[PDB]
């Protein structure tokens, strides 16, 4: 179902990011700040080997904890293997490198109950064009919850 980006240069996604919008196939995955896949991406750090370190924050033990996820390169381009969040795959759908990035996470064992997708942006501002790209990519996908954040929320993102 999912169509991944072709000709992705992973080195060009490095730097600071913000989670502008999130979507998921199951409401329980994103509803409430303490939900399993409610994650806020803060930085993408690609490696020389072609892997992707994802820095993000997540609600745990009563507060916003900082997590580092190592996404390993696989034989399929724009698809990375992870062992976190009960997910095993990160899929980069699209990016223009300097404004927005669209990606999804899933578990290959049950991809319909585990699919979460995000729209990332470089600056803590609403990019209507990025949201349009996000919505278009989501049309084919069976999403039952969609969240969209404003500039004020994008500053600290996760907060007690």
- Strands 15-16 and 63-73: what pairing? unpaired
> On the CB side of 120, how many CA atoms lie within 13 Å of its CA?
28
Considering only residues 2 through 31, tell me which ones interact with a copy of itself, judged by CB under 8 A: 27, 31
Reduced to 3 states (helix: H, G, I; strand: E, B; else coil), residue 83 is: strand
* Cβ atoms 17, 103 nearer than 8 A: no
Q: Does 65 bind a copy of itself (CB under 8 A)?
A: no
**Could you say which of a copy of itself, Zn ion, none residue 32 binds, taking C-beta under 5 to 8 angstroms by partner kind?**
a copy of itself
Nearer to a copy of itself, 22 or 104 (CB): 22
Question: Which stretch, 10-18, 46-54, 82-90, 141-149, contacts a copy of itself (CB under 8 A)?
Answer: 141-149
* Cβ atoms 69, 86 nearer than 8 A: no
State the binding string over 66-105 for a copy of itself (x if CB under 8 A, else -): ----------------------------------------
Question: Which stretch, 13-21, 77-85, 95-103, 136-144, contacts Zn ion (CB under 5 A)?
Answer: 136-144
State how far the Cα of 111 lies from the Cα of 152, in Å rounded to an integer.
33
Q: Does 53 bind Zn ion (CB under 5 A)?
A: no
- Which neighbouring-strand residues pair with 84? 87
């Amino acid at each position: 179902v999912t169509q991944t980006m072709k000709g992705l240069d992973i080195q060009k996604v490095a730097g600071t990011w913000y989670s502008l919008a999130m979507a998921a196939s199951d409401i329980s995955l994103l509803d409430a700040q303490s939900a399993p896949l409610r994650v806020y991406v803060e930085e993408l750090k690609p490696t020389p080997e072609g892997d992707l370190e994802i820095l993000l924050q997540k609600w745990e033990n009563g507060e916003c904890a900082q997590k580092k996820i190592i996404a390993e390169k696989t034989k399929i381009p724009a698809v990375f293997k992870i062992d976190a969040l009960n997910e095993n795959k990160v899929l980069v759908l699209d990016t223009d490198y300097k404004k927005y990035l669209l990606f999804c996470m899933e578990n290959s064992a049950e991809p319909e109950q585990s699919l979460a997708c995000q729209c990332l942006v470089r600056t803590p501002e609403v990019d209507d064009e990025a949201l349009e790209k996000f919505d278009k990519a989501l049309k084919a996908l069976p999403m039952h919850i969609r969240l969209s954040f404003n500039p004020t929320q994008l500053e600290e993102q996760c907060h007690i």
